[PDB]
Amino acid sequence: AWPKVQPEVNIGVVGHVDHGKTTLVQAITGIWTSKHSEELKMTIKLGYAETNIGVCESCKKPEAYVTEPSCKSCGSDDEPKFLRRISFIDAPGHEVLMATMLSGAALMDGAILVVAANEPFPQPQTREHFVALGIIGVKNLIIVQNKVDVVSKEEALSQYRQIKQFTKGTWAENVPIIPVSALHKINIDSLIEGIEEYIKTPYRDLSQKPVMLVIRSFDVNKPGTQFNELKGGVIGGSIIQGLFKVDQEIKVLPGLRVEKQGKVSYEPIFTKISSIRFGDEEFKEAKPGGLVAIGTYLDPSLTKADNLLGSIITLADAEVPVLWNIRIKYNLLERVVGAKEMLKVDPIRAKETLMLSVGSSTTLGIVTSVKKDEIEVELRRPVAVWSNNIRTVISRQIAGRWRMIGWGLVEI
Ligand SMILES: Nc1nc2c(ncn2[C@@H]2O[C@H](COP(=O)(O)OP(=O)(O)O)[C@@H](O)[C@H]2O)c(=O)[nH]1
Ligand SMILES: [Mg+2]
């Protein structure tokens, strides 16, 4: 029947708070995103909801589209044609969402801009998310008009107009607008069809060296003491490129922090892949797409606290520079994140202490020199630079709190 494969596409869900991202994700997948549980909390709150997509050939559209191995909803006893498993990226925070997208933490091959039909468009967060979408160059964008139930058939009209006008003269000039109610499960199939049409699975260079982004780490082992029965540490993450295998030898970068009297260094952590799993199904290899769990032979202490948070996984023999001093070609956002006002950002200065997030990593840095849009930065925690223009997000000290001011590309 329907096979069991890992997800092959990451689709980000963006849009202003209370507009219905989580509800939309639940509509498509049937999963309520976690782990926010009770509102709480540098841990990366990110929900990964998965589902398979299929087409009921014997049905017409959009009803032919299903997420379960049945076509009964269409009226056929045939089995649907499996297409692909999808992974959705959802966030509890607007700040968290911006930091994830701008730092290259939330790898997405396309996205979904959630827009409430009951609020004036575009809301501030909708704008900022749009700029974010543009910057990281996700062009496969579906704009979703949500909450169409609490609005007259003619108010969504006005909204659509506003959207299409907002997009004219931009790259999103031709991106579609699909109206639905996430809450009432209305016209969701159409959105699946659209997801199939405008957000296609990209070609992936199987040759490139394997890189995993560690977005979490932990200890599976239970409270009752195993006593030598202990399962090794598990690392959760997203694979950027290439493939990892079971039993494959890998290393964690930068790795273990060592301090020899004011002498700060990092030693790569070497281990073997004991297991791979997406969801609750086990696998043999792991490619880009979706959130993976990697069973290792690590001592569960090294991984217990999301301790290897902000790290990178590569093959053990891979030549990846772990840099202490980096160069960034940066840009300043027009608005400080989540702030109401205008041009309240000064370009980067001399001895300034910043907070840089490169991927899942977060470290303090000091600017040593600054050209125009070219800054040299010295870090308290080095960064594994696995490609040329990997991205970072920049925060400076304002009023006793870290505030995102810009973003940039690392250059070597
Ligand atoms: N009337 C209506 N309400 C909705 C719809 N979708 C979500 N809501 C409500 O909006 C609130 C915010 O939903 P949520 O999914 O948490 O939004 P997000 O996570 O901020 O995108 C929830 O209390 C829902 O009850 C919709 O399609 N119609
Ligand atoms: Mg939510």
Structural domains for the chain? 1-204 (3.40.50.300), 205-319 (2.40.30.10), 320-412 (2.40.30.10)
The answer to whether the annotation marks 182 as part of a ligand binding site is yes
Residue 133 gets the label, from left (phi > 0), alpha (psi -120 to 50) or beta, of alpha
113: burial class by Cβ within 10 Å (0-12, 13-18, 19+)? buried
> Which of 22, 8, 81, 15 has the alpha carbon at shortest distance from 51?
8
The protein residues having their C-beta less than 5 angstroms from ligand 2 (an ion) are 22
Angle at 46 between CA 40 and CA 47, to 5 degrees: 105
Q: b vs e for 10-44, b when ≥16 Cβ sit within 10 Å of the residue's Cβ?
A: bbbbbbbeebbbbbbbbbbbebebeebeeeeeeeb
* Ligand 1 neighbourhood includes 22 CB (under 6 angstroms): yes
Q: b vs e for 394-409, b when ≥16 Cβ sit within 10 Å of the residue's Cβ?
A: bbbeeeeeebbbbbbe
Closest residue to atom 12 of ligand 1, CA basis? 18
Q: How far apart are CA 309 and CA 286, in angstroms?
A: 19
Method of structure determination: X-ray
* Ligand 1 neighbourhood includes 23 CB (under 6 angstroms): yes
82: burial class by Cβ within 10 Å (0-12, 13-18, 19+)? middle
223: burial class by Cβ within 10 Å (0-12, 13-18, 19+)? exposed
> Which of 210, 217, 311, 294 has the alpha carbon at shortest distance from 256?
311
Q: Locate all alpha helices (DSSP H) within 30-137, ordered by sequence.
A: 94-103, 124-135
- Asked whether 362 and 355 are in contact (CB, 8 A), the reply is yes
Instruction: Tell which atom from ligand 1 comes closest to the C-alpha of 15.
Output: 21
- Asked whether 45 and 38 are in contact (CB, 8 A), the reply is no
In sequence order, the 6+-apart residues with CB closer than 8 A to the CB of 229 are: none
- Asked whether 55 and 69 are in contact (CB, 8 A), the reply is no
Residue 191 gets the label, from left (phi > 0), alpha (psi -120 to 50) or beta, of alpha
> Which of 295, 303, 333, 313 has the alpha carbon at shortest distance from 99?
333
Q: What is the DSSP letter of 73?
A: T
- Resolution of the solved structure (Å): 2.6
